[PDB]
């Protein structure tokens, strides 16, 4: 697990010969795959600027290892996510969302999903790097895996402040998101529900933008779902959207969710029964 020849590895990361660079990169990356204590030791040795410079490497095997190491670093604490941001990795990560190599694009998205799982200032850093126009594009992707990581990234960015929710809305994520509510795959569906629930937890205007995108009929159709998770999520989104004004409550009523909410109180579930009684009470004010 813990090595003690790390400063020599960072010195080998800037080696003119490809083999002694790859060896140092391979061993240094495996160390970043470990615990948060191991991720500090690689940061403290100053591996970060060398790994960031490696995101512009014309070798795919170097690029893929640099990128994998950096996504594991971003899977650490909030000050370790900050170290990645501060090292300037974000513009190189956003440029890699246009890679013709699907494996590199996927590795970039996963790194981005990790950074955007940090603080609101770290979410903003991602928005400022301009990842939003690229993630909304990736929502049209025929690649199931790209679609999952792009929705995970957007769902995190949408858990931020209301201006950050608006950034996602103005990037036009909503039409692609409401389209994904009909999708056959359970996971991508749970992810679209996740992203929309977060957008619906914003200001009344942002709640209305969700309604305007045509999310309400699809959400009412998910209350008659066999899957307990999509059922739970369909009502989290329905409760969040009901937290708006009288217009944001009447829109829910007009969709037909009234009789649907009444039935989910006689349901055998214990979590869904209490979620339903907390939802219709919010709708009657």
């Amino acid at each position: 697990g813990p090595g003690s020849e790390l400063p020599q590895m960072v010195q080998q990361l800037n080696s003119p010969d490809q083999q002694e660079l790859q060896s140092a990169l391979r061993k240094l990356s495996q160390i970043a795959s470990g615990g948060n204590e191991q991720i500090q030791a690689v940061i403290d040795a100053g591996a970060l600027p060398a790994l960031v410079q490696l995101l512009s490497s014309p070798n795919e095997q170097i690029l893929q290892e640099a990128l994998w190491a950096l996504s594991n670093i971003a899977s650490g604490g909030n000050e370790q996510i900050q170290a990645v941001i501060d090292a300037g990795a974000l513009p190189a990560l956003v440029q890699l969302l246009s890679s013709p190599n699907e494996q590199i694009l996927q590795e970039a998205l996963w790194a981005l999903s990790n950074i955007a799982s940090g603080g609101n200032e770290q979410i903003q850093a991602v928005i400022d790097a301009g990842a939003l126009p690229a993630l909304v594009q990736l929502l049209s992707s025929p690649n199931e895996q790209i679609l999952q990581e792009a929705l995970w990234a957007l769902s995190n960015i949408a858990s931020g402040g209301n201006e950050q929710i608006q950034a996602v809305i103005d990037a036009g994520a909503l039409p692609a998101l409401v389209q994904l509510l009909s999708s056959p795959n359970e996971q991508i569906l749970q992810e679209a529900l996740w992203a929309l629930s977060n957008i619906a937890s914003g200001g009344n205007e942002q709640i209305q933008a969700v309604i305007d995108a045509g999310a309400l009929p699809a959400l009412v159709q998910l209350l008659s779902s066999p899957n307990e998770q999509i059922l739970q999520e369909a009502l989290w989104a329905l409760s969040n959207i009901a937290s708006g004004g009288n217009e944001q409550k009447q829109a829910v009523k007009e969709a037909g969710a009234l009789e649907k909410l009444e039935q989910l109180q006689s349901h055998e579930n214990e979590k869904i029964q209490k979620e339903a009684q907390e939802a219709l009470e919010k709708l009657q004010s």
Partner: protein
């Protein structure tokens, strides 16, 4: 107040691990010749390593299969095994992706013939492909395999995985018990070797096992000789 969900995508023990985070389309192509009886099989479906679930439909494109479908189950993608979070460092299979691995096997049917198989398991675009060559020798024409005396099922048991550090691969030796229609059992001895195709670093595991459960079925609207296969696979045998 309103509730918000935020979560990191997580730590990855290998780059290849990430390529199985959702549902992955599978293609299986088999070229067979058992005792001179040439046949070809093609399977399509999906794999979900998150839950360890495979759903595939195999069709004999050459006509009638000369051998029973259960004898081909082991030959017809261990990269879709669910590796619990504490065992992710022991997943050789996903770690060898996308460039893939070579899977070689000798299957010895007790007091009957032997199958020699060579397969290339890798990604071709977003599809996980398993392209195989199988050669069968010394089979009894009135045996349980050539005479189709085996029941249409596949017994749930544990395959033990061991490292092969000198070949940068994996090895496994397990027995398969096929049920015979009369009431007896036809044993199939499996000797396996897996080696990476690429030159990238690979996850070499500590000894553990794969627990697999299989359901063989027939599509009612399928006139071709086929097999609908459902599998549940989980890695175990290494503690916290």
């Amino acid at each position: 107040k309103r509730k918000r969900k935020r979560k990191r995508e997580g730590k990855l023990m290998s780059k290849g691990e990430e390529l199985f985070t959702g549902v992955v389309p599978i293609l299986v192509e088999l070229d067979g010749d058992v005792n001179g009886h040439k046949f070809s099989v093609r399977g399509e479906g999906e794999g979900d390593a998150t839950n360890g679930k495979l759903t595939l439909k195999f069709i004999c494109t050459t006509g009638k299969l000369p051998v029973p479908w259960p004898t081909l189950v082991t030959t017809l993608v261990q990269c879709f095994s669910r590796y619990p979070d504490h065992m992710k460092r022991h997943d050789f299979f996903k770690s060898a992706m996308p460039e893939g691995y070579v899977q070689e096997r000798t299957i010895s049917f007790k007091d009957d013939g032997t199958y020699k198989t060579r397969a290339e398991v890798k990604f071709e675009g977003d599809t996980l492909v398993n392209r195989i060559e199988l050669k069968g020798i010394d089979f009894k024409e009135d045996g349980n395999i050539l005479g189709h005396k085996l029941e249409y099922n596949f017994n749930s048991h544990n395959v033990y995985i061991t490292a092969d550090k000198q070949k940068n691969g994996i090895k496994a030796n397990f027995k398969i018990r096929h049920n015979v229609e009369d009431g007896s059992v036809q044993l199939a001895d499996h000797y396996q070797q897996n080696t990476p195709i690429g030159d990238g670093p690979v996850l070499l595991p500590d000894n553990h096992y794969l627990s697999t459960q299989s359901v063989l079925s027939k599509d009612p609207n399928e006139k071709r000789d086929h097999m609908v296969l459902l599998e549940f696979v989980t890695a175990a045998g290494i503690t916290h």
